[PDB]
Amino acid sequence: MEKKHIYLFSSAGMSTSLLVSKMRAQAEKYEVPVIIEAFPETLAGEKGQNADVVLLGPQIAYMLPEIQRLLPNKPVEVIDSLLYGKVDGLGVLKAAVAAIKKAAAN
Incomplete structure (x- = not known):
């Protein structure tokens, strides 16, 4: 492992694709151990799987x-x-994190 997958499933298209590619900026403007991919909500079943957190x-x-x-x-x-x-894709790095903590609950 040693890295995970912040996955994005698109509303219109291009209010995401560059938000992953900035969220990416984030990750390597740091070292945050995560690939950000975004799809045509067509994959999310399968890619959703292959992700560790989803959007x-x-x-x-x-x-x-x-x-x-x-x-x-x-x-x-x-x-x-x-x-x-x-x-x-810097609120979307934070806002991901927020997700994976809104995971837990008994």
Whole structure:
């Protein structure tokens, strides 16, 4: 192991793709041990799996009840839509973390 996978499942497209690629900035502007990938919410079933923490578009939000069957455990989290389409992969590094702590609960 020695690194994990911050995965993103897209609302419109390009309020994410560069937010991963900045969130990436983050990771190697540090050393944070995680790949950030973002898909066309088509993969998240399979990629969701291959991830350690997950994300999905604000606007395709609807899929999360689904996404949560496919994976009824993981630290999945649909984005915010202005952090999204302002492509803030430094709140999205923090906001990931927040997810994987909103994991636990008995």
